[PDB]
Design a binder for this molecule. Structure first.
Ligand SMILES: [Cl-]
Lengths: 9, 110
């Protein structure tokens, strides 16, 4: 299940 | 054109977009990019997406009949965040702190 990732890229 | 109440709303919106709350407000600046974040189920779960830029757009375009219409969208934004993300997610904690700011401002509307 997809979880949104706030961590920077 | 804006009524006095809808001017106060634009004031609140202007505050939610300021650097004062940026720490927890930035995930709501623009629409949720289901592409970039690779959320393949976001639009299947969230039927009516909403964010601060959209609220600003409709506010500038005078698309709000009253203050209740403004609050409905702002709360829809928070509702979508609570609905899609797990309760323990940091973005939920961000939404809650930003909603604290909104509800507090909105309640003290003259
Ligand atoms: Cl500012």
């Amino acid at each position: 299940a997809p979880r949104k990732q706030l961590a920077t890229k | 054109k804006l009524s006095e109440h809808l001017r106060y709303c634009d004031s609140i919106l202007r505050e939610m977009l300021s650097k004062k709350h940026a720490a927890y407000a930035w995930p709501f600046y623009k629409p949720v990019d289901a592409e970039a974040l690779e959320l393949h189920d976001y639009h299947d779960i969230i039927k009516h997406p909403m964010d601060l830029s959209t609220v600003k757009r409709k506010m500038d375009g005078r698309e709000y009949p009253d203050a209740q219409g403004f609050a409905a969208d702002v709360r829809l934004m928070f509702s979508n965040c609570y609905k899609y993300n797990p309760p323990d997610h940091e973005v939920v904690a961000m939404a809650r702190k930003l909603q604290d700011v909104f509800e507090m401002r909105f309640a003290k509307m003259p």
